[PDB]
Amino acid sequence: GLVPHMDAATAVELLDAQPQVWHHFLGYINSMTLQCALELDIADVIHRHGHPIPLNQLAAALEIPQTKAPFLSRLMRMLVHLGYFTQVITKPEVLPSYWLAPLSRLLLKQNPYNARSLTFCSVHEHLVDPWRQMSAWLRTGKGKDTPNAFAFAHEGKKVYEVCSEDANFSQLFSEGMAGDSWLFSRALVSKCRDAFEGLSSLVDVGGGTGNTSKVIAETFPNIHCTVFDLPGPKQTHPNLDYESGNMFTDEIPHADAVLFKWVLCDWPDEPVLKMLKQCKKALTKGKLMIADHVLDHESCNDSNSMGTSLILDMLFMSFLEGSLRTEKQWAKLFAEAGFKDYKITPVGGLRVLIEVYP
Amino acid sequence: MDAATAVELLDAQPQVWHHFLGYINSMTLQCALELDIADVIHRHGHPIPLNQLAAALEIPQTKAPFLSRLMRMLVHLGYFTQVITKPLPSYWLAPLSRLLLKQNPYNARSLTFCSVHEHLVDPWRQMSAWLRTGKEDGKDTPNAFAFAHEGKKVYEVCSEDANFSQLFSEGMAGDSWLFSRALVSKCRDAFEGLSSLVDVGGGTGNTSKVIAETFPNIHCTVFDLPHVVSGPKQTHPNLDYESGNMFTDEIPHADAVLFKWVLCDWPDEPVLKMLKQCKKALTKKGKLMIADHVLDHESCNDSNSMGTSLILDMLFMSFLEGSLRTEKQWAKLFAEAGFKDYKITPVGGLRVLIEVYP
C-alpha cells in the first residue's frame, strides 16, 4: 500500500508503552521456556548436583553440546528472572553457576505436588491450537456450533472424548489434578479446620484417586470419606472408600457434607443448578462444601491474583464449559437451588471454601 | 510438611500457572485484533453496550456472554475500560488501545500477528531437541525455527509466503515511525555536524525520513535488500535508497552509519566483520550509531522491562540469529572492531542510542 503530526513527548510516551503490548503478545514465550525447562529436567539435574552447578557441567548433564551452551545460558537467564533458579559468577574475568530458588520446588519430580503434568497438558497442542479458531467460534451462531473452541477445533469432540482417544494426554490431566489436590487439601484442612468439626461423613464428588479425601481422613479421624467419581492405584485409608457414578445423572451418596473440589467451575449454570437441587433434596441437614474460585473475593483481588484468575477464566472458556464465578453468581445459584445461607473461608491458590446450608 | 509450608506453596502455585498459561495473553490479544475490537469501539465514538458490541463484531447475541468474558480479560490487560452506567457492560478505549488502532501508522497489529503466528510458535516444541543437537550428525541448524522448517531460515520462509513476509515489514515500519521521533528528540545532539548518514537495514525509510526532515544538512541513504526498497516507501529530496546485502556488499559511505534494531538479529562473528568494515570506512572521521538494546541499561533495568527484554532475547534466539547484548558484550565488539570510545543515551521502548567513535 501507498505511504500514509505528533509532538516528541507523545511519541516517546507511546514508544514506552509499546513494550507492554510486546509483553502480552509474547506471553507464549513464558509457556514454552518453562516447558523446555521441564523437558530438559533442569531443576532435577541442578538439585541432583547438590550445590551450584557451573554452566559447562549443566550443559553436559543435559546432553547439550558445548557449542549450544551459550543458548542454554540465555534460557537459564530467562528462568532466573521467572524465579525458578539463581545464578552467580565465581570465576573472575563468563561462567555462571546455577542453583535453585524457592519456586523451583514446584518443578521437582521428587515432589508429589510438582506442576510438571499440569504444565505439559496446559501448553499441549490440544489446548493451544483451538485458540486460533476462537474468533471464528465466537462468530458461529446456532449447525456448525460447538460448546467451545476446543470442540470447534476437534471435529466436535469435547476434551473428555479427546482424552479417551489420547491416553498420554489424559494421564497429564489426571496427574496434574492429583498434584494440585495434594497441596490444596493440606491447606484446606488447616485453613478451614472449623468446617470439618462435627462431621462424621463426607462425599468427595469428582475425588479421583482420593488425594483430597486421604488428607481429610488423616486429619479428622472420625470422618468417613467416600470418593464419588466416574469409572492409577487409589489412595488407601481405613476411613476412605470409593463409589462409582455420574454426578449429573446418578444419585450422589449421602453424607454429612458434600464436597466439590475444583469441579463446579468446569460446568455451566444449568447442569450445576440441577445438581445442586439434587444435593439440597438429599442434605435435608448436612451441608455443601465448595472448594473453588470466588473470582472477586477479597482474598484474591490483588492485581496479580486477578490477572491469573482471568487467565484461568479464559482457559476454561476455551476447553471446558465453565468459568470462574463471582460471589454474586455463586449466591444466585445457591438461592435458586434452595439453599438458605453460606459462609466463605479463604484457603489459598486463588481459591476459597464455601460452606452452603440448606 | 507443615501446614504453613503447604499454604505457602499453594499460594506460590498461581505464579507457575501464570507462566505456563502465558500463551493465553498472546491468544486473547490476537482475538481482539482479529475481531477489530479497538477499531469498532473507536468508530462507535462513545462507550458501547455489550449487545451492540456483539452485533458490531458479528458475534451472535447468544455468544455475548463469552464476549463479555473476553472483554473482562482485555480490560484487565489495559486495552479497554468498562464504563459504569448504573449503581449490561459498556466498553470504551484505554490509552494502550492507541497501539491497536488500524488508522495509526504506529499500531502494533502486524507485529502481533507475525509474532504469534504458527511459524514462530511451533518451533518452540522442538527447542529442547535443537538444544541437544550437535554439529557432527549434520542435522543441526542455526536456530529452532530452521530446525522446524526443514532447514529454512525465516527469510526463506518469508520469500515463500508473501502475506507472512508483509507482517514483518509492516511491523518494523510501525516501530520505526515511533522510535525515530523519540530518537531525534532525545538524541538531537548526536546528529550535530553530520552531512550524511546511511541507514543500514532502513527498510521503507521511516527512520531516515524523520532524520532528513529534522536535520536538513543530512543526506540520508537507506541501504537494504532490493525487494525491500522496490515498493512504496518514505520519500524526501534528501532521502534515497540503495540496494544490497549488508554482509556481502559494500555499505555506502557516510559521516554516520546507523543500525536501528538490526544488529540484534545477528551473531557476533558477522557483526564484528561488518563493524570492522565500518571502522575502516569511517576513518578513510565519522561515527557509528547503533539504536538497539543494551540489556543492562538503567532505562530498562526495572523488573517489568527486564522481563520483556528477556522474552525478546528468547524470541530472537528461536527465530533469528541474534540476542539482546549487554554493555559488556557491545563494548567487546567495539574494541575488537578497533573503535576508541562510545556514548550511550536512552531513547525508549527498551532501547538506546550508542554512538561509537573510531
Side-chain angles (χ1 to χ4, degrees), chain A residues 1-4 6-89 92-93 96-141 143 145-167 169-196 198-242 244-250 252-253 255-269 271-273 275-277 279-280 282-297 299-331 333-339 341-358, chain B residues 1-42 44-85 87-134 138 140-162 164-268 270-279 281-283 286-339 341-358:
Chain A
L2 298 191
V3 160
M6 175 180 295
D7 66 16
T10 305
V12 169
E13 169 186 310
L14 282 165
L15 184 61
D16 282 336
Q18 184 161 239
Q20 292 178 53
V21 183
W22 295 351
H23 192 97
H24 292 151
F25 68 64
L26 298 176
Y28 71 87
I29 295 286
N30 289 331
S31 305
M32 293 294 103
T33 56
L34 184 52
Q35 179 171 238
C36 286
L38 301 186
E39 297 175 328
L40 298 168
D41 283 5
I42 299 185
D44 317 271
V45 166
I46 293 177
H47 185 261
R48 180 182 61 185
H49 194 78
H51 66 287
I53 186 174
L55 173 68
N56 64 317
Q57 295 185 17
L58 179 63
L62 301 180
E63 297 181 9
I64 293 173
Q66 293 299 322
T67 53
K68 297 271 172 80
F71 300 116
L72 173 63
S73 177
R74 294 162 60 190
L75 174 64
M76 291 302 292
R77 177 171 61 188
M78 177 79 255
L79 294 160
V80 168
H81 178 82
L82 291 184
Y84 297 103
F85 307 119
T86 63
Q87 57 177 69
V88 293
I89 302 174
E93 300 179 353
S97 294
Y98 302 100
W99 187 235
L100 308 168
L103 205 65
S104 66
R105 289 173 293 176
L106 291 166
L107 302 193
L108 290 169
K109 284 179 181 180
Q110 70 171 21
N111 293 338
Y113 54 88
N114 77 73
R116 290 175 49 87
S117 290
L118 200 53
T119 300
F120 288 136
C121 66
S122 300
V123 304
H124 192 286
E125 295 92 329
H126 279 318
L127 267 54
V128 177
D129 288 351
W131 277 93
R132 297 192 185 281
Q133 299 187 243
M134 177 63 73
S135 296
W137 177 78
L138 285 166
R139 286 173 159 164
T140 302
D145 200 20
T146 56
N148 54 33
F150 179 101
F152 194 70
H154 284 89
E155 304 191 304
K157 301 174 182 180
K158 294 176 180 185
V159 67
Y160 310 94
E161 180 170 1
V162 174
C163 283
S164 73
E165 298 176 341
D166 198 337
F169 182 58
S170 184
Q171 179 174 310
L172 297 170
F173 285 93
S174 303
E175 291 174 339
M177 296 302 92
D180 177 79
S181 288
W182 191 99
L183 210 45
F184 183 86
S185 65
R186 284 165 171 78
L188 177 60
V189 303
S190 176
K191 286 284 179 183
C192 303
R193 174 169 272 263
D194 291 348
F196 294 92
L199 299 183
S200 291
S201 59
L202 174 147
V203 180
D204 184 355
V205 181
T209 53
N211 269 15
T212 303
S213 286
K214 171 76 176 296
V215 163
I216 294 171
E218 295 179 313
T219 304
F220 307 102
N222 304 307
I223 303 186
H224 174 207
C225 292
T226 299
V227 169
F228 183 68
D229 210 337
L230 291 175
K234 303 184 166 61
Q235 291 272 10
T236 68
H237 187 278
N239 278 345
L240 173 52
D241 49 26
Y242 297 83
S244 299
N246 181 334
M247 73 192 285
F248 293 114
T249 67
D250 297 330
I252 300 182
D256 295 351
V258 172
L259 173 66
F260 293 91
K261 181 261 174 185
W262 226 19
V263 165
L264 293 184
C265 57
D266 297 357
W267 302 104
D269 291 347
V272 169
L273 176 57
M275 180 161 47
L276 295 180
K277 285 180 180 174
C279 289
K280 187 260 162 69
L283 296 169
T284 50
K285 286 195 181 183
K287 72 188 170 201
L288 184 57
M289 297 177 72
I290 294 169
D292 210 317
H293 306 263
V294 173
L295 178 66
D296 61 341
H297 197 254
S299 65
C300 56
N301 69 6
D302 63 276
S303 180
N304 283 358
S305 289
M306 175 61 60
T308 305
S309 294
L310 293 179
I311 285 184
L312 291 174
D313 189 61
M314 289 294 91
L315 171 69
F316 291 4
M317 182 173 83
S318 75
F319 93 101
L320 298 171
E321 292 172 55
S323 62
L324 279 66
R325 298 169 172 93
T326 60
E327 181 171 350
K328 181 192 239 293
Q329 287 170 315
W330 281 118
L333 282 161
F334 303 154
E336 285 187 13
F339 291 82
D341 192 26
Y342 67 89
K343 179 184 180 183
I344 299 173
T345 301
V347 176
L350 306 182
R351 291 166 282 175
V352 299
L353 173 65
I354 320 173
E355 288 169 277
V356 191
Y357 295 89
Chain B
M1 171 181 306
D2 59 29
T5 301
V7 174
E8 170 182 307
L9 284 163
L10 182 69
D11 280 337
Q13 189 160 241
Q15 294 175 52
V16 181
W17 294 352
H18 195 102
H19 293 157
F20 67 63
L21 298 176
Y23 70 87
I24 297 282
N25 286 341
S26 302
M27 295 295 95
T28 54
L29 182 50
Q30 179 170 237
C31 284
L33 300 186
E34 292 175 334
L35 293 171
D36 289 342
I37 304 183
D39 319 273
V40 163
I41 293 173
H42 186 257
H44 196 71
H46 62 102
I48 187 171
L50 175 67
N51 59 352
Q52 298 186 34
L53 181 61
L57 300 181
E58 308 215 25
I59 287 164
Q61 295 295 313
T62 52
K63 295 269 178 82
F66 303 110
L67 172 62
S68 183
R69 292 161 64 187
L70 176 68
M71 290 303 290
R72 178 168 64 186
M73 177 78 184
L74 295 163
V75 169
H76 183 79
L77 291 181
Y79 296 96
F80 305 110
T81 60
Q82 185 180 330
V83 176
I84 312 172
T85 63
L88 183 73
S90 283
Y91 304 99
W92 186 237
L93 303 173
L96 211 51
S97 66
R98 292 171 292 173
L99 292 175
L100 306 189
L101 295 169
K102 288 173 170 182
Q103 64 183 229
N104 288 336
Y106 49 87
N107 78 71
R109 291 171 52 86
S110 292
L111 197 52
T112 296
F113 285 136
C114 67
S115 296
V116 306
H117 196 283
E118 35 274 85
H119 277 317
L120 264 57
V121 179
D122 292 349
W124 278 96
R125 299 195 186 278
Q126 293 186 249
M127 179 65 74
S128 296
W130 174 79
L131 285 168
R132 286 167 153 171
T133 298
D140 201 17
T141 56
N143 53 29
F145 177 102
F147 194 73
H149 285 88
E150 300 189 296
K152 292 171 181 174
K153 301 161 141 202
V154 60
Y155 310 93
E156 186 168 354
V157 174
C158 284
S159 71
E160 293 172 2
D161 187 347
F164 185 59
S165 179
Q166 179 174 333
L167 292 176
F168 282 97
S169 308
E170 295 172 337
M172 291 183 291
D175 177 78
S176 289
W177 192 101
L178 277 180
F179 186 88
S180 62
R181 289 168 168 75
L183 175 63
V184 304
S185 172
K186 287 193 149 287
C187 300
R188 174 185 183 83
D189 292 345
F191 298 90
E192 191 174 340
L194 301 176
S195 70
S196 55
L197 178 146
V198 57
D199 184 356
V200 181
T204 55
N206 268 337
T207 306
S208 287
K209 175 57 175 292
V210 168
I211 296 168
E213 291 216 282
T214 308
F215 303 104
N217 294 322
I218 309 188
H219 179 254
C220 290
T221 295
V222 165
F223 184 67
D224 210 329
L225 294 171
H227 66 272
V228 176
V229 301
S230 61
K233 49 194 177 292
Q234 294 289 348
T235 62
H236 184 279
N238 225 6
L239 174 54
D240 42 55
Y241 296 83
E242 177 163 330
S243 62
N245 181 309
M246 64 180 176
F247 299 113
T248 59
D249 298 321
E250 183 173 13
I251 296 169
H253 301 170
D255 292 347
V257 177
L258 167 68
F259 291 97
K260 176 261 173 187
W261 222 17
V262 170
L263 299 185
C264 54
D265 297 351
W266 299 106
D268 282 3
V271 168
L272 177 57
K273 177 174 179 175
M274 188 167 59
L275 294 190
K276 288 184 174 174
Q277 290 167 335
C278 291
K279 184 261 162 64
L282 293 165
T283 54
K287 72 172 155 195
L288 171 62
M289 300 174 70
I290 293 166
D292 211 315
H293 304 264
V294 170
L295 182 64
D296 55 333
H297 194 260
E298 62 173 324
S299 68
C300 50
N301 77 3
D302 58 285
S303 178
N304 287 338
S305 298
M306 177 61 63
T308 306
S309 293
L310 293 179
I311 282 173
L312 286 171
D313 188 66
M314 291 294 93
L315 172 70
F316 291 1
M317 185 175 84
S318 80
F319 95 102
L320 297 173
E321 293 171 56
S323 67
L324 277 64
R325 286 169 177 96
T326 59
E327 187 174 355
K328 179 176 273 301
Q329 289 166 316
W330 282 117
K332 178 169 166 163
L333 285 168
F334 303 155
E336 294 183 10
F339 291 88
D341 190 19
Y342 68 82
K343 177 174 169 187
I344 298 172
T345 302
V347 179
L350 305 178
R351 291 162 287 166
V352 299
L353 175 68
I354 317 175
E355 293 169 85
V356 191
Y357 312 94

